[PDB]
Structure formats: C-alpha cells, structure tokens
C-alpha cells in the first residue's frame, strides 16, 4: 500500500493553468523557509521553480507517466521530462 509523500518522491504536480508537470518532493535545507502546514515543497523540473502544494495536486510519477509524460510546448517542460527520467535526484541549483 502507499505511504505519505516523502522528500525524493517523483510526481507530476498540477498547478491551475499549467499541464501536469514533472517534479519532485524536495527536502528543506537547514535554515531554509519551511512550507505552510499540510503543504510540501515541490521542485518543478525544467523550470527549476519551487511551489508549495498539497497531495491533491501530486500524482505519483510511475502510475502517471504514460498519461502525462509527453512533450508539451510550454517553456521548460521538455527539459523537465529529461530531468525526471535521467537525473531526478541531482542538484539543479
Ligand atoms: C511552477 N510553474 C508555474 C509558475 O508559477 N510559473 C511558471 C514559470 C515562471 C513563473 C511562474 S511551472 C508548473 O513549473 O510552470
């Protein structure tokens, strides 16, 4: 059965107005800003943006890739697909 989300989990993350987007659950570094309660820090591949999202917007990558893992014209998306497939745990700083 599934566990709660944890840092390093890979997902497609959904934001109003954007296609389901390759992303990961990030860690929070020592001394770094924490997310609000019930929210996770989501690192979006390709754009390298962070937003705070709850589970309703997080789709596990293995289950969802056949549906959501296809090229999109949006800035940074295809770069994102390469990152999530080829080096999802690297430093993108
Ligand atoms: C987090 N993204 C949306 C977003 O806030 N923005 C898009 C990038 C420029 C700033 C505004 S995403 C899903 O990576 O496209």
Swiss-Prot record:
It is found in: Nucleus; Cytoplasm. Residues 7-64 form the PWWP domain. Widely expressed. High expression is found in heart, skeletal muscle, ovary and testis. Overexpression is frequently observed in hepatocellular carcinoma samples. Interacts with HDGF. Interacts with trimethylated 'Lys-36' of histone H3 (H3K36me3). Interacts with trimethylated 'Lys-79' of histone H3 (H3K79me3), but has higher affinity for H3K36me3. Interacts with IWS1. Interacts with H2AX, POGZ, RBBP8 and CBX1. Interacts with histones H3K9me3, H3K27me3 and H3K36me2. Interacts with DPF3a (isoform 2 of DPF3/BAF45C). Interacts with SMARCA4/BRG1/BAF190A, SMARCC1/BAF155 and SMARCD1/BAF60A in a DPF3a-dependent manner. Acts as an epigenetic regulator of myogenesis in cooperation with DPF3a (isoform 2 of DPF3/BAF45C). Associates with the BAF complex via its interaction with DPF3a and HDGFL2-DPF3a activate myogenic genes by increasing chromatin accessibility through recruitment of SMARCA4/BRG1/BAF190A (ATPase subunit of the BAF complex) to myogenic gene promoters. Promotes the repair of DNA double-strand breaks (DSBs) through the homologous recombination pathway by facilitating the recruitment of the DNA endonuclease RBBP8 to the DSBs. Belongs to the HDGF family. This is Hepatoma-derived growth factor-related protein 2. The chain holds residues 1 to 93 of 671 of the full protein.
